[PDB]
Structure formats: C-alpha cells, structure tokens
Amino acid sequence: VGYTPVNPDTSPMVAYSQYHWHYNLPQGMERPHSVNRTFAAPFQSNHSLVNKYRGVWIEFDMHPAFSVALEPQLRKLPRGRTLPKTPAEEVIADYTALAPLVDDEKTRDLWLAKVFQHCAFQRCGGAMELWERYCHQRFTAEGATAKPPLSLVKSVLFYCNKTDNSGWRALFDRCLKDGWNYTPLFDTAQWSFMLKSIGRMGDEDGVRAVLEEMLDVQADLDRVEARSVVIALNAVTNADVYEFVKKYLFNFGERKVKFLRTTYSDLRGHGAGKLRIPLKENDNMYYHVCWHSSIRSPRQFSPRQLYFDYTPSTL
Amino acid sequence: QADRRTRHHMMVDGQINPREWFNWHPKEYQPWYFDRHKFLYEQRQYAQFHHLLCHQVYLKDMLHLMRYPEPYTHIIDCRTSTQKMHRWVPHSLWLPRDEVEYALQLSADEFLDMYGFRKPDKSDDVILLSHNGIYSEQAGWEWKKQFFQHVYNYRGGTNELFGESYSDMNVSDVLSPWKGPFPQSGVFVDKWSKRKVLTRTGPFDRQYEMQDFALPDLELEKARHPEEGPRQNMPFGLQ
C-alpha cells in the first residue's frame, strides 16, 4: 500500500507468509540450482582485451647463428613489441649492401620481411622496389614454382596496406587455394588492415573478393575491427556488389552489426576527425547499414508511435 | 496543440485507444525479431505448425544425390498439378500432395497398387519436392505425423533445379488492410484489476508493422515520402 512498493527480502510479512517459507519450518535449501554448469556462456567483454598485440605479427624464426651474426643490422629493425626509430633509407641501404653476403634463402627472406615491416610503420613508398628486385623473380613472375615463406608475404601485404598500393591485389590472389594457400593462416589484424586499405582506395571488387575469402577461410568476423569494415563497405557503389553486401551483412552477429552502425554514424559524424583520410559520402550504404542493424535487433513496442493515425472502421 | 491522438484517452471513438502504453497486455512489450525475410512457414503466424517442421536439404545435396544415388534414400515429388510439371527430378517418384493423408494409411501392398512403387519404410530417408517448397512442407508434416524418421524438405526445390518459376499455392506476402472493428476474441480482461486491454491480434498485428517498415534501400525509401521528410503529421517529439 503506497507509491513505494515493499521489498520482498526485508519484509517478514512477505518472507514468512503462506506463499513463502515461515521461520518455524525447517530452513534447509529447497532445491539445488546448477545454472553455470548446464548451459554456459562464453566470455566476451564489453571492453576490448588490454594486452593483445594489436598489429601484424611477422614471426621471426632466424637460426640462432645469423641471428647473432646479423645483430648490428637487425638491432635497427623491429623486434617483438619494440619499434626503433631508425630512418628507413638506412635500413634498406644495409639490406642491399650486406644481404648478398649471407648465404641462406630463409635468412635473407626473414631479414627482408623485417625490412618491409619497418617500412610499413614509417609509410615510406620506395620499398616495393625491393619486392621487384629480389622476390618478384622467383615468386610472382611467369609461373615460378617457388613458394615464399609465410612471414615475407604477411609483411609485404601489410606494407601494401599501410602504404596504399595497387600491388596488393596481385599478391593476395596468389594466396588462395590453388596458389600458396596462405590465406587461412592470416591473423584477424591482417584482414582488418587489408579491408581498411582497400576501402580507402575504393575498389568494390577488391572488397568483395576479400570478404568472400574471409568468410570461406573462416576468419573471425565479429572481431574484425569495426572501423575497417565500415571503411570497406563505404567504398561500395556498384549495384551487384551492393547486393552482395546486403546478403553478406547477415554473416555478422547482433552486437557486431549494432556497432557497425554506431561506428559508421560516428565516422561520417562527430568522429570524422578520427580518420587520416576523411570518409567519402555513401548515403546509400550508410542508410543500409543502419537499416540492417534495425532489422536484426530485438524490436520494441511504442504503440503511440505505430498507431498514431489509427481510426477504427465499421465496414 | 493537443488532440485525441496526442492526449491520454482510455477510449477513442468508442473503442479501446491503442495509443496508450497502458492499454496493452504487457506481454506485447516482450522482445521479438522480424521474420518476414525468412521461409514462409518459419514465420510467427504459422506458430501452430512449428513443432512439425522438417530438416532441410540444400541444392548441393540435391545435385550430389542426382549423380550419386543411395539405394534407400527416396526422392519424392509432391507437385500437385500435372499441367505444371514438364520435367522429371532424377530418381524421383510421384505422390501428389493432395493424396498424401490417404496414401500413407495404405498397407504396403495397397500402396504398391495405387502408386506403382514401393512404400518407403519408416527408417529410410525421404526427401520431399515441390515447386516453391511449400507443398513439400505440408506433405512433410503429413509424413512426419505418420511417424517417419527421416523426412527432409528441399525448399526452393523444382524452381531451383530447373529454373522454372511456378508456385504451389498463390499466396501473397501483402496482408489485406484490416476491415472491421478490433475482434472481441483478442480483448484480454486482466485477472487482478478486471481491466480490458488490447492484444496484438487484428488491425494491430506485427505482420502489419513488418509489411510497412522502411524499405532497405535509401532511394526507394526516399521515394515513399514527401520532400521535407518521412513523418510530418506527428509532433516533433513523436517522430
């Protein structure tokens, strides 16, 4: 009785009533409850994971001989979680000079991959020359048999995305099932960077090819970084690719799709500053990603909105 | 300023006002998802049949079974009218949907005499086939009610196989706009306060909401509204 309701735990007139347990009965537990055991939820935090590497790990496997031999050259290149500020010109000079002296293929290529990664972080454009000078001959040209070491490919790809470069499309294509079959070994961050670059450059077709492979190779869709999905989708103006992207959008999860919308509305919105290159206007893809989000969320009832104009009829 | 649409009214024009948040059975606020882009019989209006649905068989399975048949898997054609069926799904057999209820109650012998092929045992795989995948579904419910253990419906069936566009029944997605008053069969008196209150049957029904929902293309959706914007009959705060 009142506008303030009784709280059923603290009130003995609830607790001890006939619909609950009186204090003179024997007070044991009624039934056991196993909730967590029967059907358990997987852990997904609202906050992203604080320790994760957040980059493209380039996997440095060197024989612990050349690793010691080449140390004064390698000390200038990135080691794990450490990014020395050495100017990229110098590093490339060192590779060009000293590398023909080393005899190992595997070593020369690990070293090269480090150089590429280093040049990806500084966004120096003259590093593809290195690909055409050493690797192109035995990997990409005229159906050469040789199969490049994975780390090298990851590194070059990462470089083509960081420095936006038409070249990526040629490399990526070699990684599908009939080629090197490297695509299932890519990191989630790899996909993230790829999508973002392709999106900036604006290839709907690059975007489609990449989303198809990602899906087939079972990438982690929900953990692909939202910004990069948005920038990729934003690039899609062509009727067919557009169709593809609706049908595809159904592959994300409820949550992912909600934040695809949030992120999208921010990047053309308040957070338009957050990007190094501003987005381009897609009103169509924006509207659609919002629409999709609305379709996939639970629906709420707002009767004064729906039935605002309802009039009954006696027909 | 204010009017019947905007003000609080228990009743508007002699019938319960649907605009009041408190005129609905609270159950109507519980969360639900849009159906409409899903297969016809998964939708919520068919809920009485939901316990009966059939495990699917996709186009891939169908082509595979064309080239590599299994002895005791039966592919059963449910197409009803002979006028519409010009091709033969490989290794199939014909039990038209209309006959099923009768057919499945024949003895092995009698069934042999009426349809000219052996009646599948209840262990065997039975794949059902139709134009759209609707009649095959209904037939499936029949086969499942006699208890047949493996009954698969191939939706999109003969249309996908042969690239024909035909339909088993003529049913359209659009609901005819609701005609009379709100049905007294949906009116729900409350048990504690004895208070009459609306339900989502009738002129208020989720079908109608999904039907008129915003189109999923900005251009086609902007075409639907006047220049200034989508809802201008409402006060700003109701938009």
Binding site: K246 | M66, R67, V89, E160, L161, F213
Partner: peptide, 21 residues
C-alpha cells in the same frame, strides 16, 4: 520490407550435369 535482395537468376542447375554425363 521484403525482398531484401534480388532473387537468384533463373539458372537451371540440373542441365549442365546431365550434359557432361
């Protein structure tokens, strides 16, 4: 709101197979 996307074209899936055979 349906249809969300353009339905698959009329393509005939049985013919190519039985033609190969």
């Amino acid at each position: 709101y349906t249809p969300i996307w353009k339905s698959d074209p009329a393509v005939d899936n049985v013919a190519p197979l039985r033609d190969e055979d």
